[PDB]
Design a protein around this ligand. Structure first.
Ligand SMILES: CC1(C)S[C@H]([C@H](NC(=O)[C@H](N)c2ccccc2)C(=O)O)N[C@H]1C(=O)O
Length: 241
């Protein structure tokens, strides 16, 4: 088993595949988990999603690296055997966009916040091939997110980064907060180096209001949690201002 220094541990319901871990969350949704080995510190887990939508699959976030992201595509090929139509990546940091080149080599259409694509070169990332844009209330402009099936993309405002986006899975009670949301038992909001400490609390709450009936909150570095992940994150963020 993989025992990361940071990130959730393995429990019943987890499938080890190569260097990665997969967990079924719903009949059509799986969480992918990949691990960055930090020398002298140990492994840091990062989570994303895989969603089946009829005869195709949709991905949220890459793994940390190209090779790990290729392993995600191999797991999808083995376990689902349907083509990946597109991937949405949730901001320009390594845990979310480190594996773009693997997606592109596979011919998968990639989407990110226009701002994430603009920041990518400055963050040592490769931009997605398509840019999402957002309304004044945070909802994605639908013309920029064609054929997204159940993925409902919401920009909650600046928080963990200025470009962080979130994704609800329509037809389920699952919503994905990425690195913006930490779990209900977290001590810290994680890396605040690129964070907006003034607006973080409002952005966390806006995510909760965007998906008000999501009962399972998925996030980058903990196991899926209740809505208390959202409220606890917001309460921690209240202390930043
Ligand atoms: C788990 C993290 C504390 S690190 C990760 C991200 N950092 C990276 O992807 C870095 N490339 C990195 C550097 C050193 C060690 C691990 C990751 C960030 O800055 O938000 N997301 C952070 C977070 O979600 O709070």
């Amino acid at each position: 088993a993989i025992r990361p220094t940071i990130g959730q541990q393995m429990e019943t319901g987890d499938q080890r595949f190569g260097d990665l871990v997969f967990r079924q969350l719903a009949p059509n949704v799986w969480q992918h988990t990949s691990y960055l080995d930090v020398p002298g510190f140990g492994a840091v887990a990062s989570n994303g999603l895989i969603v089946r939508d009829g005869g195709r699959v949709l991905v949220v976030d890459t793994a940390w690296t190209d090779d790990q992201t290729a392993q995600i595509l191999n797991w999808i090929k083995q376990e689902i055997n349907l083509p990946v139509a597109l991937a949405v990546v949730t901001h320009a940091h390594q845990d979310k966009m480190g594996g773009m080149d693997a997606l592109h080599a596979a011919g998968i259409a990639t989407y990110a916040n226009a701002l994430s694509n603009q920041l990518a070169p400055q963050e040592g990332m490769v931009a997605a091939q398509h840019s999402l844009t957002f309304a004044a209330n945070g909802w994605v402009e639908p013309a920029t997110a064609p054929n997204f099936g159940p993925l409902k993309v919401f920009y909650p405002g600046p928080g963990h980064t200025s470009d962080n986006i979130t994704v609800g899975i329509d037809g389920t009670d699952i919503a994905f907060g990425g690195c913006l949301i930490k779990d209900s038992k977290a001590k810290s909001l994680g890396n605040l180096g690129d964070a907006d400490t003034e607006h973080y609390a409002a952005s966390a709450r806006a995510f909760g209001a965007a998906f008000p009936k999501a009962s399972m909150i998925v996030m980058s570095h903990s196991a899926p949690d209740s809505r208390a992940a959202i409220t606890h994150t917001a309460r921690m963020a209240d202390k930043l201002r």
